[PDB]
Amino acid sequence: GIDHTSKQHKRSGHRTAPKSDNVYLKLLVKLYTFLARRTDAPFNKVVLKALFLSKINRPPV
Amino acid sequence: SAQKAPKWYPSEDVAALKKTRKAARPQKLRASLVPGTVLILLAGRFRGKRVVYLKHLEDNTLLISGPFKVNGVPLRRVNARYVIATSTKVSVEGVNVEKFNVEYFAKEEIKAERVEDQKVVDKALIAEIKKTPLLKQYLSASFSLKNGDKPHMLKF
């Protein structure tokens, strides 16, 4: 018995992969997954998170 | 196809064993298990036989010969966990038990050489037994538990 302060088995709430089945987007994700893991640059982690975003979360620039 | 396939198959290269850190150190016997101690056999075809402890063999077995002229138990190994060691002792240093080792009791009528090896060993055993009285009859008799016996209170 534990009185839990937080919700147990709570998901992180952020996307860990694109929702699409675009094969080219998925192999852009795996390129930047390698770069965000093997490089200390914060640029690679920001772009990797931005590749997951939905259509309304990446407005046209 | 009745069943489609596995997508990818497990490797059939068997993994090697990790390096075991388990050495084999010599077994510490009980304090009462010194050679010449009269033992009580607790299991086997020689259940309840009172035998004589002669040698600790390297396979963690006790070489006994409860003299074959006395109670008909030959030279054989027993496990130390199936034996009660009594306080009764006889001296050892008249028997040559260095001949008997682990491969002396290998497997593959009675063997010819086992008979005179028995006769050589027990000749000095009975010649030692005949000194103290009632020991030859003690070893001829077979131990058993009677009514009123409590082995937790009984000392052997």
């Binding site: - | 009745a2 069943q3 396939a5 497990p10 059939e12």
Partner: protein
């Protein structure tokens, strides 16, 4: 023999039968979860039947293995038999139920020549 594997533990060998499937004939023994408000089976009262839950899940290192140690692959002909050629230690062929007897003779003959284990070699066997 197959590959070496750990001692296979099932965690539950009894079949999970539906509640009151013994009591009524219309109630089949396929497991259904009790969803009634007052059900002692749903509420897990003592002395009642157990329910299928994820703690009974088999070890991943021995899941789907037969007691022979092989995983079961269903084959219908020689071509599906030959996919297990390099995997004799992990997969055992089992002939499909609708294979005719003359075709099964060819399948057993090929599996003996390829080293494949067959788990139903006596099916449709004239003797």
């Amino acid at each position: 023999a197959s590959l070496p594997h750990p001692k296979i533990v099932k965690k539950h060998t009894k079949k999970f039968k539906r509640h009151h499937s013994d009591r009524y004939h219309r109630v089949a023994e396929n497991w259904r979860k009790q969803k009634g408000i007052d059900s002692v089976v749903r509420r897990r009262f003592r002395g009642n039947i157990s329910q299928p839950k994820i703690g009974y899940g088999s070890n991943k290192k021995t899941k789907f293995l037969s007691p022979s140690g092989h995983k079961t692959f269903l084959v219908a002909n020689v071509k599906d038999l030959e996919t297990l050629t390099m995997h004799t230690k992990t997969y055992a062929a089992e002939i499909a139920h609708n294979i005719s007897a003359k075709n099964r003779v060819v399948i057993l003959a090929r599996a003996k020549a390829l080293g494949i284990k067959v788990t139903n070699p006596k099916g449709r066997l004239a003797l």
